[model samples]
Target: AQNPNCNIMIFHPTKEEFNDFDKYIAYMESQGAHRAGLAKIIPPKEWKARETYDNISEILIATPLQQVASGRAGVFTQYHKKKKAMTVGEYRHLANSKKYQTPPHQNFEDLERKYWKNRIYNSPIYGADISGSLFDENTKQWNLGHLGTIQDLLEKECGVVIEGVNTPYLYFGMWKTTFAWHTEDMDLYSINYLHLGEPKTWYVVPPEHGQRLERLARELFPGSSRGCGAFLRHKVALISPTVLKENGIPFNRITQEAGEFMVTFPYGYHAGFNHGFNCAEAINFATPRWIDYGKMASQCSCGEARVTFSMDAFVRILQPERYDLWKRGQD
Candidate 1:
């Protein structure tokens, strides 16, 4: 999929953003950052927001919404509520199931009309709508409100803000789900916060490089595949509590509890999976920017000229490595 035009940039709360714990609490309440969905806390005078991203050294985030009776948090489901069994095999099965297929942007458009369109004016289910703090490059506007529309939501409360160059809406939602694997009309910079839960797995592969991996995976594991085919390739940067040292790409895991941080990567093929224990908070920012197609005009290259593969393209390639698992396949 082509990168969405949304630019995702994350900054830690500065002293200006959060000076006092009470003030921070008030802001979270005002922003409706808690699970109950209401900004229940009041702002305090001592509140000092962090000024830079560095100010937020570490973060331990809990699931945003309280778990339902089924124990699922985000769009990605771990297991059935009845059995409460989390078999990697079972998880893999669900992951590969047709029930989770990612349709085209048109499908999403329909979903927006169904679930989000016109609903932006609706009151927050549990808390206020704080999406405006993040800017929208598409409309070249900002929803400056404690609460208003979805685009005005705070990154801490929402995920990341990625507005299309000309599109007026902001994008939010999990990047690690099957439904999220479709192509978008903009470039993206995914800003993620790893709080409260088990380690999440993210894979980032540059366009050409990712294509090679997909081919290799399909060839290696054809049937019952879980490696490359199953792998959603985008430039992946995993955020965890412990530092991850792989391929010599430095993705530091923030350890100082209760802080926010930001990381940037050029668009590449990327995919993510939760560690089955915790909720991960992330904000993906999209910019109205695109890459030069150059010789690969037909390939749908992005601003980096990197050719990230979409699920449609992946199926066309039909590689077996695409389904290989690092360990046992999550069923």
Candidate 2:
């Protein structure tokens, strides 16, 4: 019976005023709007995200019929045990093929196949270099992977074209596809922009309530965290809002329509599902403030499944002169 009662903050910015992404982020962070873990932005109607919103039919992705160990599902959940590799055009055609609601009687052997729609949540366009392929095309005001952003600094040091985090990953979601509860890698900031299609429903928890949620998480999945302190980011568990309320964790629900942005703060826990067929892109970035939390990040102990960052190496690359100054002062 528990429902979303908290209204997350939404920012309405005109193209002229919201031009500087860095300043806008700094303003919101200082305004304490970030305490809630989620913020929505509906920029002026003039801002058009004219990219590849229509030609997703050729996009190939992988979807698990049932929840698996690490594919956005738990080990015990009831999903058909196997992966369904297909194209978006085919998925779009069959997901609503009316084989379930009408119910087939004599030919009902594969009801699950005809009716049970698999979610393509985690299988984003993993191969495309979003910044070069899309960002360079039409969007720049919110180019989160650019030089001014924090994770871009890390990208330069790695000496490789970093994917998944700094390069920007795009997702195509349908009615039931969902993103599980988790924070960004390296405890970094995430900026998600819904490019087109139906709205996305987001559930977010304040950074303050994060530990309580983690405690509840460990209790729900006993022994999972015994070996790793930061096990939830493994992205396996999907707890509901009712569970959050019954357990005393505070959260908010937000409906994000197309052509909008959602900003996730460092250490903030958030999750949600798509309402219908839609396209969204999420880029993990950082501010100078994220360095402290990034330093506190634990993943090596969590094993290789979790990606780890070396803050020392990052800072050294990001600010060589300052790091050299500190080295001299220390000696």
Candidate 3:
């Protein structure tokens, strides 16, 4: 069980407030916002039709190495093997040339009819981390909403340039593409924004009860709990929110509409699914408070270990003048 008062919070900042970065940060901090908070910023109606989003989608469809998903099963582990797994460009060329056909009853078909369709409704695409990379010049500018957040500032100052860490991970999902329950690597915070398309449903567990939920899952699916590392990485069975609720584990739920942002706090466990075809971008970040946690996170779990940053390295690189200011602020 967890604290009933510790559920997710939703924020509705006016368009004007959202446009000002400091105001946005002030509002979030004032709320004492924690794990899995939601904010609706109400992007201009024209944002839905922006060329930046369209351009990214175009490139995604033209790229060769997009991951695909199948709808045969609801959980990732059950259906991951069924993924067609091809580059968008490869799938397109093959479909156009009639060079190949997906096995019968598979989720994807010849690209002519199912390329974009499958990607939208059945298959999910990933691996589009573009921040500070080749595509940053053209793509990152359009993520103004994210750029204005405190995490962005921290990322720039801390030199956190790792892919899927400070850099954004692009997700193109269709109906039923699911991300299993997990916390951000090393207790880092994360923000997810739905750029366009349909809503995504989220389930969040507060940091206090994250471990309890893990224990309950292990008890329920004893067969899959071979090792601590495997269980933490979700290599075990998927545990749905319904199951958690049935067992009386408290959690928060929300349906994040297009143009909204969801913030996940340190150690907050979250999982979600796309309602329909949707495109979203997410990135991890750390605050000054997270400096110590970032150092300790190196030995906690699987993904966290991979993305850990060196606190010593960060301290050494701090500008001397800024360090003095930080020191004074602590006093």
Candidate 4:
């Protein structure tokens, strides 16, 4: 059956394995970057959830910043509109300080719970510039291997200044906060490490089936376009594992715990929600094999097509070192 390996690979790494980043990259490449797991990187004794929350709240209060909204109120309503921008301090207060009160029009306690959940879920503090503060100092010592190397090349050689592609974007998510189904920009690899919080559940559709799923989605949402990029602007309908399974579509389920890393390959369609309050960091990078997809992704209509390097530039920068590998049958 095509669905034989439709389950997530859970990698429980020892301290040595955790630091050996090459193995992580290799696994992602060979397995189509569907999903893989890792043990807790930050020790509980060194960093507790309460302490992490306190530090994040302190940072929010100290800095004046606004983030794009992603809660039920925003996502279920004007998803693409920028009408719900709120300051980081206001978001923090709503999550940590405000008392839960029902609106005058709403009578049920469920509505009050929904309002509170939406408050926390709506605001995802983007911290690409401040990722250093979210982790222990030793996290910097972890070897990211090719991921770091390629990112540096893109910056130094190509003069590209895309932070989301180079650096990790730290996310502060609460219950019911959902990131809809989509692939990485230009089908590049993405790694999401949950620093602290309740588990985030993930549903992944393998790369082979991604297009088929997109076609199916278009049929279901007749008004929507055909490619994965269109889903970002349109209201993404929930496509759960049950729905996929019933349709004979292959998929995987992943419950990413605190301090664990989830690697998503290029073209892997993934969507998930936070179980409760949590913080995570995600970043994208290109592997040697990603060159072809990178070119295609650069031309995609999605406004995210900001991979600044041309094909010639990519080869000129990477070919000197990578050509031998491809020739020797290693790539």
Question: TM-score: which candidate is best?
Answer: 2
Q: Quick one: best lDDT, which candidate? A: 2
List candidate 2 stretches off by more than 4 Å. Answer: 1-7, 62-85, 99-136, 144-165, 308-331
Q: List residue ranges in candidate 1 displaced over 4 A.
A: 1-187, 221-266, 271-276, 288-331
| lDDT of each residue in 215-313, candidate 3, tens digit only | 776676565554443354442244555467778876877778876777777667777655545667776656665555444431222332133243223
lDDT of candidate 1 over 73-159, digit per residue (tens): 211211111223333233333433453322233542243223222222211111011122222223111111111222322222435
Residues 1-331 of candidate 4 have per-residue lDDT tens digits of 3224555655544555445565656654465334322112332233232234444554442232233343234223223222344444455444343332122334333433454345434443322223433545444334232247555546654575433224555666555555667776556677777777656777777766677767655655554455434553233455545456666766766577786667776667777766555667776666655655555442233433233333334433345454343233311
Look at candidate 3 and tell me the lDDT of residue 152.
49
**What stretches of model 3 exceed 4 Å from their correct place?**
1-4, 19-23, 35-52, 61-79, 82-165, 234-237, 292-331
For each candidate, C-alpha RMSD in Å?
Answer: 18.8, 8.8, 9.7, 9.0
Candidate 2 lDDT over 1-331, as tens digits, reads 1113434778887778678887888877666767888888888876766655567676665652433223222221212244566676765564445521123434322322222233333222111112322344446677544535454654544453332333566676655555667887667788888877766778788876788888887777676667557676666566666567788888887788887889998888897766556667777777767767666653323342334243334435445544554334323
Q: Report model 4's TM-score to 2 decimal places.
A: 0.63
Give the TM-score comparing model 1 with the true structure, all chains together: 0.29
In candidate 1 the C-alpha lDDT for residue 110 amounts to 45
Candidate 3, residue 4: how far the Cα is off, in Å: 6.5
